[model samples]
Target: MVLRQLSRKASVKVSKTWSGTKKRAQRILIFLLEFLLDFCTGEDSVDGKKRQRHSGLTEQTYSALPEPKAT
Candidate 1:
């Protein structure tokens, strides 16, 4: 008698279905990181006051996604 390893081929199918959601989750993570890290770097590289203001700006930007400083 010989025993063989059992594996489900459905894993590949599952991954194919999961790829779209995985990419979407990654994109959302990047967006969140962009908002969080945006406060780390800004127009002024060496100013305490600017750093403080950036913290405020980041909070506002995060709250209002459509109200960024694009203009």
Candidate 2:
């Protein structure tokens, strides 16, 4: 279920990026680095403050995953 939603969201974004200008190709790298760095650091640092650090879709995705304590 979580995997389904994640892949669908990625597919929609990839399709939009593909249809966009070729120059927009650089954005893929940017987003990848952004996502990667955020994931690397965020996962470690936000273990307790996840909600405070990430909002919206990121929060939803995490919620669908482990779902921290009933704070």
Candidate 3:
């Protein structure tokens, strides 16, 4: 269902020339490519922050304490 929606939005033609399996494979490929492009270029999510930043407070600490910490 998700693949179908994406295919419709992407304007991919699903016709007699293309079998269902072929069309599905194509859609999956397109979805993966789009995902990777967005993921790498930082456009996958609404926020500009990456997955690592969201998962931890490292960035916040670095911004607040730019100087090196003592051992």
lDDT of each: 0.54, 0.60, 0.60
TM-scores, all candidates, are 0.22, 0.31, 0.27
Clashes of each: 0, 0, 0
lDDT of 1 at 53: 40
The global Cα lDDT (0 to 1) of model 3 is 0.60
Candidates 1 and 3, the one with greater TM-score: 3
* Candidate 1 Cα misplacement greater than 4 A, ranges: 1-22, 39-71
Estimate the TM-score for candidate 1. 0.22
lDDT of 3 by residue, 1-71 (tens): 33445354345454534445565877878888889878888765586666853686555555665565432
Higher-lDDT candidate of 1 and 3: 3
Best by lDDT: 3
Pairs clashing within candidate 2: none
RMSD, model 1, all Cα superposed?
A: 19.4
lDDT of 1 at 19: 46
Per-residue lDDT, model 2, residue 33, is 78
Compare candidates 1 and 2 on TM-score and give the better one: 2
Candidate 3 Cα misplacement greater than 4 A, ranges: 1-25, 47-71
